[PDB]
Design a binder for this molecule. Sequence first.
Ligand SMILES: Nc1nc2ccc(F)cc2s1
Ligand SMILES: Nc1nc2ccc(F)cc2s1
Lengths: 209, 213
Amino acid sequence: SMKIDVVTIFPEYLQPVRQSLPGKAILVDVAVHDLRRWTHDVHKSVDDSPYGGGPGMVMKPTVWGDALDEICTSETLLVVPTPAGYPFTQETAWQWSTEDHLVIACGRYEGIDQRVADDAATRMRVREVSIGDYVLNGGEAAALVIIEAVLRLVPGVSLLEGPSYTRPPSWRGMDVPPVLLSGDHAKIAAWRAEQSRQRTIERRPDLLG
Amino acid sequence: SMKIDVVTIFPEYLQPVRLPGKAIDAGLVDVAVHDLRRWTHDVHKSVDDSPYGGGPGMVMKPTVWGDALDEICTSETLLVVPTPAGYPFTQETAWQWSTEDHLVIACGRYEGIDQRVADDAATRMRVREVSIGDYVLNGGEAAALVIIEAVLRLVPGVSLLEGPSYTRPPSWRGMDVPPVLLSGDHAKIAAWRAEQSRQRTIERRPDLLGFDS
Ligand SMILES: Nc1nc2ccc(F)cc2s1
Ligand SMILES: Nc1nc2ccc(F)cc2s1
């Protein structure tokens, strides 16, 4: 039984995930919250200029503080997607998949005032993470990736994998490698292992060192 | 002016594309989503089949994909295939693709797409199989959204880790903004921020500075 709350100024961005959940809600619950619910002024401000100057805006600690105060508990794992985070990996997804309550705080502009995470970390577990070495406009797409990578590891919803093939055996001048049709399953395994090695050398030499 | 076509068996998952929405609104980019099932011809609209050589799961049929890409792609197209087995998609990739006229993103499901699809396409156009990170998703759709966002924000007309940022009020819940940021001394602030960044990079991403883990 996992609950996921997402907080974002673009709640519509997350509709897809909710629409991808199968009739297993009848194990999981994913709720999306508009951050502007916790604003204080009639202009519904979520952003303000950075101390020390610089470009862009920083998300207000008073707004985020109120939102997390309402949504989080002592048992919550607070996930903050950010290009400045620790790497989110399959290992991370596996770890988080057994959590009872994930809260994902999606930032925009240049990030959330650091005191939000720092305050939260005094009473719950907080994880600032990056899904890869690129910059997005906001954390919403990273939240989608995280939610998908974690939930597909919840029961009931080294080397690279080599090429796969299905019917027909010949297509546009290209035959499926005959070994796959050979019925020699020891040999097929060895062939696949070698394909995996070559692909990894070529595309991800970092994985071999 | 860039054109992006996404091909998927779940076109509704690509709705969040409508900042990428502000780019489409302006008219600097056009994003179109295509249901792969549109190129099927049997009544069950089958797009997948069991793998040759054995193994778990299903593989997407080359025939349906070939017909789709035939209609959508030209020789000038950059065909992008998100896959956990791909070359890494990085900020450098995003910059490179930001000057493309036409991206076509093929979203796979199950255990992926028959390798011959990319092989065939590569005889007519440039093909890039890419991974957005070292985790497994159920399909290429979420990766397409990441790639679209990373690229579109770089389009003309649209290292180290960034350190912590702060805004008003200067004291909150008994936690103060670092005094140097309030001091108005640009050199001291630049120095403090450079330091915080290097400090955060060594702790969180030591690989960026050439260290283990
Ligand atoms: N503006 C933002 N960019 C990223 C990039 C990666 C990530 F995981 C989160 C964010 S929030
Ligand atoms: N089933 C799939 N997983 C991933 C993971 C990463 C990626 F970039 C693409 C895909 S398609």
